Structure formats: structure tokens, C-alpha cells
Amino acid sequence: LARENHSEIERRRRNKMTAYITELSDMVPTCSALARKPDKLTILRMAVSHMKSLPSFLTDQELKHLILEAADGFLFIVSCETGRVVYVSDSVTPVLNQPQSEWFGSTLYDQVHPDDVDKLREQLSTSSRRSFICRMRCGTNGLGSVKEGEPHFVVVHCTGYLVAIGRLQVTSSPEFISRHNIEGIFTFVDHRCVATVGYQPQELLGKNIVEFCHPEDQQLLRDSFQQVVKLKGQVLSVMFRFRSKTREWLWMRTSSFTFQNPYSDEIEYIICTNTN
Amino acid sequence: RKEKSRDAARSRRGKENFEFYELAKLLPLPAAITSQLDKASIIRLTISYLKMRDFANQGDIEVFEAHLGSHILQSLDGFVFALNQEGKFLYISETVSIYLGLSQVELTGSSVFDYVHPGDHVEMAEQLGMLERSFFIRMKSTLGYKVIHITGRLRMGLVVVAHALPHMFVTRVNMDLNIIYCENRISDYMDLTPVDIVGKRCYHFIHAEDVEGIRHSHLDLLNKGQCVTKYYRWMQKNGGYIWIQSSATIAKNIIWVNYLLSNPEYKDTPMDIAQL
DNA sequence: CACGACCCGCACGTACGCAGC
DNA sequence: GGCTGCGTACGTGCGGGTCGT
């Protein structure tokens, strides 16, 4: 039971090994430009020759750039009492749009969001590792709809021991959306309605959507709502007339579905996406 | 006949072994482990080194610099690695040995699929195509799997920073995200106190444009045991919302670690009916 | 730190496939 | 076709490895 197991283990080792040999053959360009396949020995002599021709595997540059491509990460070092940025890597430029000179010498308190100073303060103290989340200024955003001509504060993830890598987590920063009960009562109205239908959100809340519907499409609205109740998580869209807060009938497509809890599977509400 | 074969073949094995161990000696690892090293792991490392340099150069005051590598690497709360168009680790920092117990020499060269939990294979083969990247997997931890969260970008080859899992407050909730327990400290940051949130579930409080994302995170939590949500908006009792990011685990009571991100934005207009 | 329990690596010896005076 | 330089593939035997009750 050990002779065959072992002869086949060794065969596996020969296929494997010679596969490393032939795989490395077309790596070192000496063997990939040559006419025919060389001697194994001479192959790996070429390999050590061309390998000698050149902190593990990667240089400081390649590991910096790899942190940057990886997750928008840049190194910085500040003081643990003052906040004086005594070092920053140049990766800050393709991360925040700050020149390296506006960041070197200044304070981290001065670079974060005014509200994000307290927590930042709670970082430069005592009474060892560190990791926190803080907004930072862009210059020349990732936390909410971009405001009208305001500065841009990203959400930087800071780790370190103060020596820190600050990395962006881009995959997290995200007509008008609403919620309803199974009777179609507005249980939520996103603010976009103000510019979408004109009302204020409280001016819809508590009320039924069929109230704002055209008397000729209301029955359709009810049958549809009952249907998305009866479709489970399946989506259903309907186009109807909506009486805005200015005396006008806007044609409005709204897709909606019921939100069934991923665990208990209960109806939380019905989500509407009301678009003109 | 064979005497010539005995000593001639022993000579060939001699030349062989000498080439192998000098090739090993030149590796970017210190003399300590590059000296006494496995014979096949030699060609693993060399192959992944040429593959990784090709990988890097085919794509787009004195102290804080001399230890650039160890500062970047030991500042991050995870390990950083680079794959290729096939899945082979073309690089991985030594620091992975901290969080998974895996040897850098052992992982450099092997297919990533070898060290990820099966059943989550086709997810990752999906994610490498087999431009941003962000997902949860399960990796062989020898300290029998860890929930590894990875973020990175895909260039033909992925590049990833990854971290492990076991101005903030903790909530205990059921599996359906029904708030069971809650710390008092929420009155620090939010309008309600641990009684007017307990009883109802998380979904009556998420901003209705995020409920999609939080739903997906609920799924991933459910199937893999751990999760981190995206930057979302938790509505306040009076109006608006505040930004939260939660590290959540199971095994069964969900614990929901809410990292605070911002103050109450847009506190006038009411969104939900729970704000009237 | 034992002990067969092995498993895995390693090299050894040899057997089969190709050049050529 | 003799037989030798030259090289890769096969199988097994040995010494250094890690578990387990």
C-alpha cells in the first residue's frame, strides 16, 4: 500500500517539477528567444545568470504604488500631541488632490473635517496600534450627495502604530425613493421629492399614494400595490399621473417591491422608486 | 555501462543542487531563510518574483524612509497580496502570518483557490473574471477558516489589501436584525436612547436608498458568519440621518459594532413616518 | 522525548530515447 | 545494425520530518 502510493507521489513530483522548469523556461527571455528547448541545467544556469542581473520581493516604490492601486493608500506620520504632519508620501496626490507641500509641515487637525477633530484628538493621546475613520479635505467627496460648490471630504480609513496608512474605501459611498406599508401609506419620503414633485416630505407622510393619484389611474395603483404585495421580492413598475404641489399632472413611473427580511422573511415595507 | 552512469549522474545531480541553492541564496529574502530552503519552494519563489516584476512594470527625513516597507506593512491591520490573470499569488507580505498563520514562502506561487474555503471559489473566480473590487471570503486560518475582507483593484490580475475579523457603540440584535440590546452611549451620538430602538429591527431605521446595500451585507453575514457594511445612513427620530459603518458578527446573537462617521445631517425635513 | 505511527522529501541507481566518428 | 556521450523518466530505499493515544 506504500509502493504504489509512493511511485505515484514521485510521478506527481516529476510532472510538477518539470512543469516549474518549463514554466520558468519561457520566463527568462534567454530561453524564450532561443531556437529550441535547452538543457535543464543550462536552462537554470541562464536563470541564475539573468536573476543575478537585478521588504520582500517588492521595492519601496513598487510597494508604495501597489498600496496606492490597491486601495488609494498613502503613508503619513504626524506628532502624537501637536498633530504636526512630519511626513507624508506623495501618494496623497492621487488620493486627495493635495500637493505634497500643502500636507508636509501642517497639522492633521487642520486637514480633517472640523467635526472630525474630536475623534482625531482622541487619537493623539494616552490615559501600540491605531485605527480610525475620518473625513479629509480634497482640494486642487465620498459621504453623501455632493453639495453645491462646497469642499470635498473623503472617508479615509487610517491604520498604524503615529505612523499610519490612510486608505480610501471607495466601494461604500453611494426621482426619489419612498417606503409604504402594505396599505400604501407613505412611511418614508426621501428629500428629492421636493425637486421631483414639489411637496415637502412631511406633506406626503402618513398619507396614501392613491390620494395623490389621478382618479382614472387610482384603481390601477391599488391593483399594482396589491400585486407587489403578492409578488414577494419581485419588482413591479407602474406609470401613473401624479398631482404635484403646483397644480399639474406629471407622468410618473414607479417601480416597487416588498422588502422581505433576509432572515425572518417578514414584510418590512414596500420600497418605491418614483421617477418622472 | 552503469559506473559511468553512477558517477556521471551523481555529477549532474551535483551541478543541479549547486545551481538550486545559489539561486535560492540570491532571493529577496534574508540569508537566514533563503539559505536553508525547500527545493521546490525555491522555484515557486523565483517564478513568482519574475512574474511579479513583469506584473509591476507592465502597468500604470531618512529614518521614516529607510523602514518604508516595515512601516507600511506593520501599520496595516491586514496583509497585502498581488495575484495574476490565473489566480497565482505573485506576492504576499509576510504579515499574513499574523492573521492567518500562513507562511509567506508557502503562499508565494500557489493558486489563491488552494487557500480559500471551497464553496466560495466560484465567487472569487467570478471576481477575477475566470473595476474596483470588494468582497468577503473564507481563508485557511491555522490558529478552521477566517472571514477575510478584501478590497482592491483588478487591472489580468487582482491586487488586494485584506484584513481579518474576530466614537462607536455596540448593539445586540437577532438574526433578522431586531435590536436586542444596546449600549447607553448612543445618546452621545443619536436622538434616541436604547429603548426607542429596541423591539423594532434595523430596517425601520436605514435610509431607504441604502436598504439594498444593508440587505446584501445581511446576506453575506448570514452565509459566512461575519460582515462589514457600507457607509450607510441611520435616520434620527426628528429628521435626517447620521452616517454609520458596522462590523457585524454571529453565533446565536448578532453583534453590530457601529463606527460613527458624521454628525446629524439635514435634521429639519422628516424622511420616515417614525419622524412624525 | 519517546515510539512506531507514518508522510514527505531526496537521491540513488537504472532503464529507455537520440546524437555521432 | 555495433557502443558510447548525453538527458529525461521510473521506481524504490533511506534519513529527516509530525502526529497521536
CSV table of C-alpha atoms in Angstrom, one decimal, chain A:
chain,number,residue,atom,x,y,z
A,1,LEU,CA,0.0,0.0,0.0
A,2,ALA,CA,3.1,2.2,0.2
A,3,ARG,CA,5.0,1.2,-3.0
A,4,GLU,CA,2.3,2.4,-5.4
A,5,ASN,CA,1.3,5.5,-3.3
A,6,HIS,CA,4.9,6.5,-3.4
A,7,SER,CA,5.7,5.7,-7.0
A,8,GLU,CA,2.7,7.9,-7.9
A,9,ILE,CA,3.6,10.6,-5.5
A,10,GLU,CA,7.1,10.7,-7.1
A,11,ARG,CA,5.5,10.8,-10.6
A,12,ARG,CA,3.4,13.8,-9.4
A,13,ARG,CA,6.7,15.4,-8.3
A,14,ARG,CA,8.2,14.9,-11.7
A,15,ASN,CA,5.2,16.4,-13.6
A,16,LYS,CA,5.2,19.3,-11.0
A,17,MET,CA,9.0,19.9,-11.0
A,18,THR,CA,9.4,19.7,-14.8
A,19,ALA,CA,6.4,22.0,-15.1
A,20,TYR,CA,8.2,24.6,-12.9
A,21,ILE,CA,11.2,24.1,-15.2
A,22,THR,CA,9.3,24.6,-18.4
A,23,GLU,CA,7.2,27.4,-16.9
A,24,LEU,CA,10.4,29.2,-15.9
A,25,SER,CA,11.8,28.4,-19.4
A,26,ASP,CA,9.6,31.0,-21.1
A,27,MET,CA,10.1,33.5,-18.3
A,28,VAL,CA,13.8,34.3,-18.6
A,29,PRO,CA,13.9,35.7,-22.1
A,30,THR,CA,17.2,34.0,-23.0
A,31,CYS,CA,15.3,30.6,-23.2
A,32,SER,CA,12.3,32.2,-24.8
A,33,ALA,CA,14.3,33.7,-27.7
A,34,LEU,CA,16.4,30.6,-28.2
A,35,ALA,CA,15.7,28.3,-31.2
A,36,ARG,CA,14.9,25.0,-29.3
A,37,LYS,CA,14.3,23.8,-25.8
A,38,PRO,CA,17.6,23.9,-23.9
A,39,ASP,CA,19.2,21.5,-21.4
A,40,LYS,CA,17.6,21.7,-17.9
A,41,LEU,CA,21.0,22.5,-16.4
A,42,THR,CA,21.8,25.2,-18.9
A,43,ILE,CA,18.2,26.5,-18.6
A,44,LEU,CA,18.7,27.2,-14.9
A,45,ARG,CA,22.2,28.5,-15.3
A,46,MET,CA,20.6,31.1,-17.6
A,47,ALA,CA,18.1,31.6,-14.9
A,48,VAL,CA,20.6,32.4,-12.2
A,49,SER,CA,22.6,34.5,-14.6
A,50,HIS,CA,19.6,36.6,-15.5
A,51,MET,CA,18.3,36.6,-11.9
A,52,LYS,CA,21.6,38.0,-10.5
A,53,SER,CA,21.2,40.7,-13.2
A,54,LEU,CA,18.9,42.5,-10.7
A,55,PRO,CA,11.0,44.3,2.4
A,56,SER,CA,10.5,41.1,0.3
A,57,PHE,CA,10.1,40.8,-3.5
A,58,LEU,CA,9.0,44.4,-3.9
A,59,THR,CA,10.9,47.7,-3.7
A,60,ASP,CA,9.8,50.6,-1.6
A,61,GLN,CA,8.4,52.2,-4.8
A,62,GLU,CA,6.6,49.1,-6.0
A,63,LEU,CA,5.0,48.6,-2.6
A,64,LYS,CA,4.0,52.2,-2.3
A,65,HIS,CA,2.4,52.2,-5.8
A,66,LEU,CA,0.9,48.8,-5.0
A,67,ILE,CA,-0.7,50.2,-1.8
A,68,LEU,CA,-2.0,53.1,-4.0
A,69,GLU,CA,-3.5,51.0,-6.8
A,70,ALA,CA,-4.6,48.5,-4.0
A,71,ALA,CA,-6.8,50.9,-2.0
A,72,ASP,CA,-5.9,54.5,-2.5
A,73,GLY,CA,-3.4,54.2,0.4
A,74,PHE,CA,-0.8,56.8,1.4
A,75,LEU,CA,1.6,56.9,4.3
A,76,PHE,CA,1.7,59.8,6.7
A,77,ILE,CA,3.4,60.4,10.1
A,78,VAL,CA,2.2,63.1,12.5
A,79,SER,CA,3.1,64.0,16.1
A,80,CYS,CA,1.1,62.3,18.9
A,81,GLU,CA,0.4,65.6,20.7
A,82,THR,CA,0.6,68.5,18.3
A,83,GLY,CA,-0.7,66.9,15.1
A,84,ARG,CA,2.2,68.2,13.0
A,85,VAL,CA,2.5,66.2,9.8
A,86,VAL,CA,6.2,65.4,9.9
A,87,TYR,CA,6.0,63.2,6.9
A,88,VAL,CA,3.7,62.2,4.0
A,89,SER,CA,4.2,60.1,0.9
A,90,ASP,CA,3.4,61.5,-2.5
A,91,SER,CA,0.6,59.1,-2.9
A,92,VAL,CA,-1.6,61.7,-1.3
A,93,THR,CA,-1.9,63.5,-4.6
A,94,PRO,CA,-3.8,60.7,-6.5
A,95,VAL,CA,-5.8,60.2,-3.2
A,96,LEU,CA,-6.9,63.7,-2.0
A,97,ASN,CA,-5.6,66.2,-4.6
A,98,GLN,CA,-3.4,67.9,-2.0
A,99,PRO,CA,0.1,68.7,-3.2
A,100,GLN,CA,2.8,67.1,-1.0
A,101,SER,CA,3.9,70.5,0.2
A,102,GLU,CA,0.4,71.6,1.5
A,103,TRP,CA,0.4,68.4,3.6
A,104,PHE,CA,4.0,68.4,4.9
A,105,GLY,CA,4.6,70.6,7.9
A,106,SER,CA,0.9,71.3,8.6
A,107,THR,CA,-1.5,69.7,11.2
A,108,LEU,CA,-3.7,66.7,10.8
A,109,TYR,CA,-6.3,68.6,12.9
A,110,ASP,CA,-6.2,71.3,10.2
A,111,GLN,CA,-6.6,68.7,7.3
A,112,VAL,CA,-9.6,66.7,8.6
A,113,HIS,CA,-13.2,67.8,8.8
A,114,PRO,CA,-14.0,70.4,11.5
A,115,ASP,CA,-16.4,67.9,13.2
A,116,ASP,CA,-13.9,65.1,12.8
A,117,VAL,CA,-11.3,66.8,15.0
A,118,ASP,CA,-12.6,65.5,18.4
A,119,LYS,CA,-12.1,61.8,17.3
A,120,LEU,CA,-8.8,62.8,15.7
A,121,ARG,CA,-7.8,64.4,19.0
A,122,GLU,CA,-8.8,61.1,20.7
A,123,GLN,CA,-6.1,59.6,18.5
A,124,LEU,CA,-3.1,61.8,19.6
A,125,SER,CA,-3.2,60.7,23.2
A,126,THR,CA,-3.0,58.5,26.3
A,127,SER,CA,-4.7,57.7,29.6
A,128,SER,CA,0.7,50.2,20.2
A,129,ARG,CA,-1.7,50.3,17.3
A,130,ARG,CA,-4.3,52.8,16.0
A,131,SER,CA,-7.2,52.6,13.6
A,132,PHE,CA,-9.9,55.1,13.0
A,133,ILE,CA,-12.2,56.6,10.3
A,134,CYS,CA,-12.1,60.3,9.4
A,135,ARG,CA,-13.1,62.7,6.7
A,136,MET,CA,-10.5,64.7,4.9
A,137,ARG,CA,-10.4,67.7,2.6
A,138,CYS,CA,-9.7,67.3,-1.2
A,139,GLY,CA,-8.6,70.5,-2.8
A,140,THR,CA,-6.9,71.1,-6.1
A,141,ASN,CA,-16.2,63.6,-1.8
A,142,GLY,CA,-17.4,60.2,-0.6
A,143,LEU,CA,-20.1,60.7,2.1
A,144,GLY,CA,-23.4,61.9,0.7
A,145,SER,CA,-24.6,63.8,-2.4
A,146,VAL,CA,-22.1,66.4,-3.4
A,147,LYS,CA,-23.1,69.8,-2.1
A,148,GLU,CA,-23.4,72.9,-4.2
A,149,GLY,CA,-19.9,74.2,-4.6
A,150,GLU,CA,-18.6,73.1,-1.2
A,151,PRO,CA,-15.3,71.3,-0.4
A,152,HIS,CA,-14.9,67.5,-0.8
A,153,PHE,CA,-14.3,65.4,2.3
A,154,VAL,CA,-13.5,61.7,1.6
A,155,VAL,CA,-13.8,59.0,4.3
A,156,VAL,CA,-10.2,57.9,5.0
A,157,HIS,CA,-9.5,54.6,6.8
A,158,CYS,CA,-6.4,55.1,9.0
A,159,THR,CA,-4.3,52.3,10.4
A,160,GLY,CA,-0.9,52.4,12.0
A,161,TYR,CA,1.2,52.2,15.2
A,162,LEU,CA,2.0,57.9,14.9
A,163,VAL,CA,2.7,56.1,11.6
A,164,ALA,CA,-0.3,55.4,9.5
A,165,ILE,CA,-1.5,54.3,6.1
A,166,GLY,CA,-4.6,56.2,5.1
A,167,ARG,CA,-6.6,54.2,2.5
A,168,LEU,CA,-9.9,55.0,0.8
A,169,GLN,CA,-12.8,52.6,0.8
A,170,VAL,CA,-14.4,53.8,-2.4
A,171,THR,CA,-16.9,50.9,-2.6
A,172,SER,CA,-19.1,52.3,0.1
A,173,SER,CA,-20.1,55.8,-0.9
A,174,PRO,CA,-23.4,55.6,-2.8
A,175,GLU,CA,-36.7,60.9,-9.0
A,176,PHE,CA,-37.0,59.9,-5.3
A,177,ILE,CA,-37.3,56.8,-3.1
A,178,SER,CA,-40.2,56.2,-0.7
A,179,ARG,CA,-41.5,53.4,1.6
A,180,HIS,CA,-45.0,52.3,2.3
A,181,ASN,CA,-47.0,49.8,4.4
A,182,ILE,CA,-49.0,47.0,2.7
A,183,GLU,CA,-51.9,49.5,2.6
A,184,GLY,CA,-49.8,52.0,0.6
A,185,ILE,CA,-49.3,54.7,3.3
A,186,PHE,CA,-46.2,56.8,2.9
A,187,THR,CA,-43.9,55.6,5.7
A,188,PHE,CA,-40.9,57.3,4.2
A,189,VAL,CA,-40.2,60.0,1.6
A,190,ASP,CA,-36.6,60.9,0.5
A,191,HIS,CA,-36.0,64.6,0.2
A,192,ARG,CA,-35.6,64.5,-3.6
A,193,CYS,CA,-39.4,64.8,-3.8
A,194,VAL,CA,-39.0,68.5,-3.1
A,195,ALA,CA,-37.4,68.9,-6.6
A,196,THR,CA,-39.3,65.9,-8.1
A,197,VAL,CA,-42.9,66.6,-7.1
A,198,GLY,CA,-42.6,69.9,-5.2
A,199,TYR,CA,-44.0,68.8,-1.9
A,200,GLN,CA,-42.2,68.7,1.4
A,201,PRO,CA,-41.6,65.2,2.8
A,202,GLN,CA,-43.9,65.6,5.8
A,203,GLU,CA,-46.6,66.9,3.3
A,204,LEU,CA,-46.7,63.3,2.0
A,205,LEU,CA,-46.0,61.3,5.1
A,206,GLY,CA,-48.9,59.4,6.8
A,207,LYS,CA,-50.9,59.7,3.6
A,208,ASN,CA,-51.8,57.2,0.9
A,209,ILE,CA,-50.3,57.4,-2.6
A,210,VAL,CA,-53.7,56.8,-4.3
A,211,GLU,CA,-54.7,60.2,-2.7
A,212,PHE,CA,-52.2,61.9,-5.0
A,213,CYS,CA,-53.2,59.7,-8.0
A,214,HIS,CA,-55.4,60.7,-10.9
A,215,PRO,CA,-58.9,59.5,-10.4
A,216,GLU,CA,-58.7,57.5,-13.6
A,217,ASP,CA,-55.5,55.6,-12.7
A,218,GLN,CA,-56.2,55.1,-9.0
A,219,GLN,CA,-57.7,51.6,-9.4
A,220,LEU,CA,-54.5,50.6,-11.4
A,221,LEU,CA,-52.5,52.0,-8.5
A,222,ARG,CA,-54.3,49.8,-6.0
A,223,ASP,CA,-54.2,46.6,-8.1
A,224,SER,CA,-50.5,47.2,-8.6
A,225,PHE,CA,-49.8,47.7,-4.9
A,226,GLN,CA,-51.8,44.5,-4.0
A,227,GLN,CA,-49.7,42.8,-6.7
A,228,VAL,CA,-46.3,43.8,-5.3
A,229,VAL,CA,-47.6,42.6,-2.0
A,230,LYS,CA,-48.4,39.3,-3.9
A,231,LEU,CA,-45.1,39.3,-5.8
A,232,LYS,CA,-42.8,38.9,-2.8
A,233,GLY,CA,-39.4,40.3,-3.6
A,234,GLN,CA,-40.2,40.6,-7.3
A,235,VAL,CA,-40.3,44.1,-8.7
A,236,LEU,CA,-43.3,45.7,-10.5
A,237,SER,CA,-43.3,49.1,-12.1
A,238,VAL,CA,-46.3,51.3,-12.9
A,239,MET,CA,-46.8,54.6,-14.8
A,240,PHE,CA,-49.5,57.0,-13.4
A,241,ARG,CA,-50.4,60.6,-13.1
A,242,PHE,CA,-49.2,62.4,-10.0
A,243,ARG,CA,-50.7,65.7,-8.8
A,244,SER,CA,-47.6,67.8,-7.9
A,245,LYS,CA,-47.6,70.7,-5.4
A,246,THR,CA,-48.0,73.3,-8.2
A,247,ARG,CA,-51.2,72.1,-9.9
A,248,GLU,CA,-50.0,69.8,-12.6
A,249,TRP,CA,-50.3,66.1,-13.7
A,250,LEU,CA,-46.8,64.7,-14.0
A,251,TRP,CA,-46.4,61.3,-15.7
A,252,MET,CA,-44.6,59.2,-13.2
A,253,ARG,CA,-43.1,55.7,-13.5
A,254,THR,CA,-42.6,54.0,-10.1
A,255,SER,CA,-41.0,50.5,-9.7
A,256,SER,CA,-41.8,48.9,-6.3
A,257,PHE,CA,-41.3,45.7,-4.4
A,258,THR,CA,-41.8,44.3,-0.9
A,259,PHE,CA,-38.7,44.1,1.3
A,260,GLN,CA,-38.7,40.7,2.8
A,261,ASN,CA,-36.3,40.3,5.8
A,262,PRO,CA,-33.3,38.1,4.8
A,263,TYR,CA,-33.8,36.0,7.9
A,264,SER,CA,-37.4,36.1,9.4
A,265,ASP,CA,-38.7,36.9,5.8
A,266,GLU,CA,-41.3,39.3,7.2
A,267,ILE,CA,-42.6,42.3,5.3
A,268,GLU,CA,-40.6,45.3,6.5
A,269,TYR,CA,-42.2,47.7,4.0
A,270,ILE,CA,-42.6,48.3,0.2
A,271,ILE,CA,-39.9,50.3,-1.5
A,272,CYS,CA,-40.9,52.7,-4.3
A,273,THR,CA,-38.7,54.4,-6.8
A,274,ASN,CA,-40.8,57.3,-8.1
A,275,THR,CA,-39.3,58.8,-11.3
A,276,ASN,CA,-40.9,61.2,-13.8
